[PDB]
């Protein structure tokens, strides 16, 4: 019984590969060759957020593009006024082994998780005037890798137990479980419409899941090693992945395959974080080589470099208005680039 | 700056001061990482908050020294995914069941259990993150090993072992075998103790080793060691 089903799976995978190859008409290099290059991008540091005492593991911009939250291994969640450099909130964590943090797209809640296998939701707008823990989502077997608010009451998490989970925060129960990944899920990215989301895991594959139907819509397999970072194109029809094979990749949802590879001989280290520019023309990636690279997403040539982190660049994010970039690194500093 | 801008600046300054006092308070604790292969007796060491987290933290105090001990057994992923989080601990306490060198009780080449203990020790001691972190090595179950070495020899897992089957000789052979896995003997120390479960010398030994580690860290941070 097992032999027949293995053979059927082999035929199905072969037919998927054949359909993908038949769909591949022309690369995004020949039909983007007439595009003028962006040239040399020169972004300068405008702000330096000091105050974390251990390395920074995650940061997230608020939707107003002025407030941001960072998570550090000193057990602390700090909200920063990117404009004045003022720190608005300092939230102590019951577990200092934090790995992810999210900012609700209303400003009222923050989330954080890590090696405790629990996603803690903190209320930022309380009548008593201090940040208090709103809920603790428990049920993941492994550590929390990423979390993203769908809404004030819905949150999607990825964990090292090889599953993602959609949680209704009002009750503390996961409404949906997303299974199918073989390795630990490292990264998560929500579509701008929040109908779909994409996740990268240690099996070197990315999966697109329908949040409502709770099933895997598609699978993308081009990377040679673990996928640490994933990000949606602003259109919502493409996403970029960053792996530790020193390569970033671009995948189209409608074409169901990979479009472009962002790599260089001088680059040997793996990607920690990826993000797009407001129009999606530039792709920003942070590396273990202590800096970030700005790629022309259409032409796959390196447009610039954001060298400003004595340690590995662990997180990076672009504002909603596209004005500035934020990089958090293992040297305990946050830098804002214009 | 407006009045409200000034007040927000003052609030940010207050938060900064509180962060620095919290960092000073947190720097006072000696943080140790517990490690050991399957059924190595690290539970009986830690007995000498968490549901499935595998980040079990034990805080205690010995002779005015604050210890935070982190047990990471419940995490079922590869260590490469979370071991970098512990780059910066004062020491790694590695527990090895001395009396378990015949039974398999794990995936193994032909027949051993000390092989995976050696492999884990080699992977941990020789690691990018723990380049200078010291190891406190505990060799548990000395009496069961005594009777085992009386009934069975070390050869079935130590082919190069020579000398009469005695407790001290076999125990020192385990000493040497585990302590020679170090490849940077000029950078980090190994503190090895034969766990006397009938005495309180295990915690005293950890205290002495941690005191030595603290002194060495201070001295080599200023170029004196």
């Amino acid at each position, epitope marked *: 019984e097992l032999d027949q089903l293995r053979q059927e799976a082999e035929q199905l995978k072969n037919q998927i590969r054949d359909a993908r190859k038949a769909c591949a008409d022309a690369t995004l290099s020949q039909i983007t060759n007439n595009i003028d290059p962006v040239g040399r991008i020169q972004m300068r540091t405008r702000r330096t957020l000091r105050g974390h005492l251990a390395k920074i593991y995650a940061m997230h911009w608020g939707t107003d593009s*002025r*407030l941001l939250v960072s998570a550090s291994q000193d057990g602390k969640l700090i909200i920063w*006024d990117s404009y*004045t450099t*003022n720190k*608005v*909130h300092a939230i102590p964590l019951r577990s200092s082994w934090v790995m992810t943090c999210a900012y609700a797209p209303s*400003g009222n809640y923050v989330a954080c998780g890590g090696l405790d296998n629990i996603c803690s939701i903190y209320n930022l*707008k309380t*009548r*008593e*005037g*201090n940040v208090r823990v709103s809920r603790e989502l428990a049920g993941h077997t492994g550590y929390l890798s990423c979390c993203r608010f769908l809404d004030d009451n819905q949150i999607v998490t990825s964990s090292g137990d090889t599953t993602c989970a959609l949680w209704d925060i009002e009750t503390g129960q996961q409404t949906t479980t997303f299974t199918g990944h073989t390795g630990d899920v490292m990264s998560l990215s929500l579509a701008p419409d929040t109908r779909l989301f994409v996740s990268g895991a240690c099996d070197a594959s990315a999966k697109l899941w329908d949040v409502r139907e709770g099933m895997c819509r598609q699978t993308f397999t081009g990377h040679e090693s673990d996928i640490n970072a994933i990000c949606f194109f602003p259109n919502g029809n493409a996403f970029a992945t960053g792996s530790d094979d020193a390569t970033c990749r671009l995948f189209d949802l409608r074409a169901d395959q990979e479009l472009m590879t962002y790599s260089h001989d001088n680059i040997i280290c793996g990607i920690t974080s990826v993000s797009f520019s407001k129009s999606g023309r530039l792709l920003l990636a942070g590396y273990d080589d202590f800096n970030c690279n700005v790629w022309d997403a259409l032409k796959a040539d390196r447009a610039g470099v954001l060298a400003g982190h004595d340690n590995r660049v662990s997180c990076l994010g672009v504002t909603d208005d596209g004005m500035a970039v934020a990089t958090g690194s293992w040297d305990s500093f946050l830098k804002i680039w214009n | 700056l*407006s*009045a*409200e*801008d*000034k*007040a*927000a600046v*003052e*609030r940010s300054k*207050m938060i900064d001061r509180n962060l620095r006092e919290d960092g000073e308070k947190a720097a006072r604790e000696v943080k140790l990482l517990l490690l050991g292969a399957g059924e190595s007796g690290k539970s009986t060491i830690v007995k000498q908050r968490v549901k499935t987290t595998g980040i079990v933290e034990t805080h205690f105090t010995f002779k005015d020294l604050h210890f935070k001990m982190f047990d990471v057994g419940g995490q079922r992923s590869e260590r490469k995914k979370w071991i970098h989080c512990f780059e910066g601990v004062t020491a790694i306490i590695f527990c090895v069941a001395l009396s378990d060198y015949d039974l398999v009780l794990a995936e193994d080449e032909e027949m051993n259990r000390m092989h995976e203990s050696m492999k884990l020790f080699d992977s941990i001691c020789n690691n990018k993150w723990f380049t200078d972190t010291s190891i406190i090595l505990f060799l548990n179950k000395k009496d069961l090993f005594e009777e085992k070495i009386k009934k069975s020899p070390l050869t079935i897992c130590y082919p190069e072992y020579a000398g009469s089957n005695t407790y001290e000789e076999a125990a020192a052979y385990i000493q040497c075998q585990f302590e020679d896995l170090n490849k940077r003997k000029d950078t980090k120390e190994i503190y090895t103790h034969f766990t006397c479960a009938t005495d309180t010398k295990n915690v005293q030994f950890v205290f002495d080793a941690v005191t030595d580690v603290i002194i060495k860290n201070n001295l080599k941070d200023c170029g004196l060691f």
Partner: single-chain antibody
Amino acid sequence: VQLVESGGGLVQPGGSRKLSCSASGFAFSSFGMHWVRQAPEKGLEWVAYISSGSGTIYYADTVKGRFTISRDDPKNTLFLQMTSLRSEDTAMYYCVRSIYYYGSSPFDFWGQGTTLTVSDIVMTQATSSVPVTPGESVSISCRSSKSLLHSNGNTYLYWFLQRPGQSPQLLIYRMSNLASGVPDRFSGSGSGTAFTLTISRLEAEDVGVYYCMQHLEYPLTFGAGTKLEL
């Protein structure tokens, strides 16, 4: 959240008195505190401010040298020591909590007040009392001596409401933001030196005195007060 005042009464002129406020239900130490007096005949008047952490302290020009504001954080208490009290110091004294960070709402909660019996921005109310009926829309105007819009891009104008027999309650902060728990029928608008508060579909419980205050700089200045009655 509760702020309870105590220490009022009858004091002979030239004497001393101590007002104490007890705070409960909120993190007292992270809030700045204001003492605000209101005479039995006129409207509100800012008296003093102490910052969270006991840093800056501000006094009104008429109380400087005589009054002293302090706070005991472990006991969650706010103290006002007044000496050499004159006949002009008889008023109801309120304690206001006000927290300051990006996006906060200062002057959000007020105490019940205690009764004691013995350059600068000018805020002008165009009307002192207008007649209204339930179900209608009313507009209240306030004028500033100088522009309350700052270079940082926000206008430091606040609208408060005092219903008959209770302490003032925050309505609008920064000239445009609706306070928490306030019905979505009030709207603040305008520009520098000219502000309007509009109530659409008014009814009972809205009658009372509306005040406009500036927070551009110290001393904080209130308006004369516009009264809405049936």
